[PDB]
């Protein structure tokens, strides 16, 4: 492909200096401007030539990203994928998005399955309140470290993360949260489901299509970081105001992170959409952990596909330690 | 000509800088791009190088325009329009031979964006600055053919006063409010901010914005950029009174749309000739912008 590209160019660049040519040749025919014209051809002619023969011959912002474990890739022979894929041509896999692409999958039956199988191990390893507990202490100092990070204060977050805990852990408040999920689309509560697929995807994803706006003022090398961030709270403190109008229960499930939104989303829009190169590359390794976590847990080859237990000790794993290495990548500045 | 043959090949080595953007590999990228930069240079380089008036536009058009506002001003078919605006182009430029007349309506625009920003509780000392340069700009002659580049740039067909103001300006501006970014929006209709947190959140937004857009200008001292001079600084008044929670800044800048828009419509109503017709246009004009600037003195 990029040699097909560079051969069009060498055609594109031929067929340029022989325009440019003509001209010349033909202003070199024919007042002061008339010869200025020809000796400027001539220049841009020369420059063309040259150039020639060298032929013939949201911004993301990188980041250190390679974290990498032992895989049981053995077999072939994968009874929990048979299940989730009998499942899926069952017909009771009810996606919001279908990132099969996203996934790397074959084909929807394959993401249909895979996806099936793995909300079945997340949730399954959450069982254990020790992992749900350390989860959440380590999405919380993450996020803190983070907003540290800003030269903010991770006060509210702190109880917006904690009123958010609260009401997780409350599950006289399930029906609530699949009241609140389910009309907005999403199918079941399980956490990829509402927390993966619902939340953080797509907010990587919001983050890809910002307006016109808020990145022109993320963007301004004549702001400080202050201004910037200030800037930025403003506009979401206003936007979260506007959309918690619309919400059917001021205390439910959205109207609950959108408390955690107003505190976290400015720290990380300042960190993506910035100019800093320091907070961007932080966003960008937590972003591509992220993404490589969704990547990993879809993969045969990457955890085992043949038991629940095995699943759900293989996904367990994988989310373990990259939200460590996000968490340490943050808090050691 | 030569000029059509020179556009030809600016728009081929365009398409092969495109191209070029889409140990040994590195060598290769720091060479492409050494290519690439040497491309873009002559690139630049290349870059550089009864019913009587009706009748006058009646069948005038057996008239080029940018947007067809038929149903803008009510009457009867596109050709109606092409007539009527034909006719209304010819008493706007010929009203504004009068140089006193000119210096008025400039007196009076000046005074009553003033009392806009004014009302925002702001200074509009950067608006003056802005508003003369370009004030400057239009009456020095030498800038005729640069103003001209611009707007014809844009797609707009002639140089008078209604097809760069009126049509261009201030007409895409009463639409461009209607249609406002949900993040502005959101932010201007904040019941829980004052009015110094709007106007201070909007400017760094517009500011930004126009230093977004002036970056993409071919002349920073073109009619474009002088313009937006002008936006810089009264736009953040202006927005925040249209879109903002005051009822008071709201009702004037309604009455403000209601004025300019009434005035383009009486403009394009029958119920004649070069010299009435003239006349016409400049009493009304000249009624519509003293009320708003009454209306706005008073409060
Ligand atoms: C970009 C970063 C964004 C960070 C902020 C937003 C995301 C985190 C905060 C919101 C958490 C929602 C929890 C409920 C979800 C649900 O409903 O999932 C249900 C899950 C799955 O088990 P189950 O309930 O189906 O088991 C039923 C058995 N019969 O179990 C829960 O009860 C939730 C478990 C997680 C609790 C939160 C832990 C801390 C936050 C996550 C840490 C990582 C942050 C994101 C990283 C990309
Ligand atoms: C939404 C509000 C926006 C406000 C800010 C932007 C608009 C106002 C400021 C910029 C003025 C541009 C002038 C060029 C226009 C043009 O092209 O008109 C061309 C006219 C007509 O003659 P001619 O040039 O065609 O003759 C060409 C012969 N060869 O003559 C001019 O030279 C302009 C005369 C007017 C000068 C400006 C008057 C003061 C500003 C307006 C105040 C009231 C508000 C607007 C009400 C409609």
Same mark, same amino acid.
Do not use: H, P
């Given at each position: 492909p990029i040699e097909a590209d560079i051969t069009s160019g060498q055609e594109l660049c031929t067929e340029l200096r022989k325009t440019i040519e003509k001209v010349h040749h033909n202003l070199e025919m024919v007042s002061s401007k008339d010869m200025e014209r020809s000796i400027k051809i001539e220049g841009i002619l020369k420059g063309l030539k040259q150039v020639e023969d060298e032929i013939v011959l949201a911004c993301?912002?990188?980041?250190?990203?390679?974290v990498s474990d032992a895989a049981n890739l053995d077999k072939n022979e994968l009874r929990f994928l048979d299940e989730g894929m009998q499942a899926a041509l069952n017909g009771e896999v009810? $996606?919001?998005?279908? #990132?099969? *692409?996203?996934?790397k999958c074959d084909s929807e039956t394959d993401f249909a399955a895979k996806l099936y199988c793995v909300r079945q191990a997340l949730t399954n390893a959450l069982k254990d309140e020790h992992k749900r507990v350390w989860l959440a202490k380590c999405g919380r100092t993450l996020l803190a470290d983070f907003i540290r990070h800003t030269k903010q204060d991770p006060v509210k977050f702190f109880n917006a993360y904690d009123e958010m805990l609260e009401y997780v852990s409350n599950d006289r408040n399930e029906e609530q949260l699949r009241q609140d999920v389910e009309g907005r689309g999403v199918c079941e509560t399980g956490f990829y489901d509402v927390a993966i697929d619902f939340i953080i995807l797509d907010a990587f994803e919001d983050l890809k299509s910002p307006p016109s706006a808020v990145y022109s003022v993320t963007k301004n090398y004549f702001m400080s970081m202050s201004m910037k961030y200030s800037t930025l709270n403003t506009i979401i403190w206003s936007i979260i105001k506007s959309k918690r109008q619309r919400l059917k229960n001021p205390?439910?499930?959205? %109207?609950?992170? $959108? =408390?955690?939104?107003?505190?976290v989303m400015p720290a990380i829009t300042l960190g993506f959409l910035g100019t800093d190169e320091r907070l961007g590359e932080l966003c960008? $390794?937590?972003? *591509?952990? /992220?993404?490589?976590?969704?990547?990993?847990?879809? +993969?045969?080859?990457? /955890?085992? $596909?043949?038991?629940?237990? *095995?699943?759900?000790?293989?996904?367990?794993? /994988?989310? #373990? +330690? #990259?939200?460590? %290495? /996000?968490?340490?990548?943050?808090? =050691?500045?």
């Open positions: 993301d912002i990188d980041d250190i990203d390679f009810k $996606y919001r998005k279908s #990132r099969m *692409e996203f996934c205390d439910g499930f959205i %109207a609950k992170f $959108y =408390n955690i939104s107003e505190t960008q $390794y937590f972003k *591509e952990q /992220v993404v490589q976590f969704v990547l990993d847990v879809f +993969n045969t080859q990457k /955890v085992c $596909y043949r038991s629940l237990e *095995e699943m759900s000790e293989d996904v367990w794993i /994988v989310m #373990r +330690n #990259r939200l460590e %290495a /996000v968490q340490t990548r943050m808090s =050691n500045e």
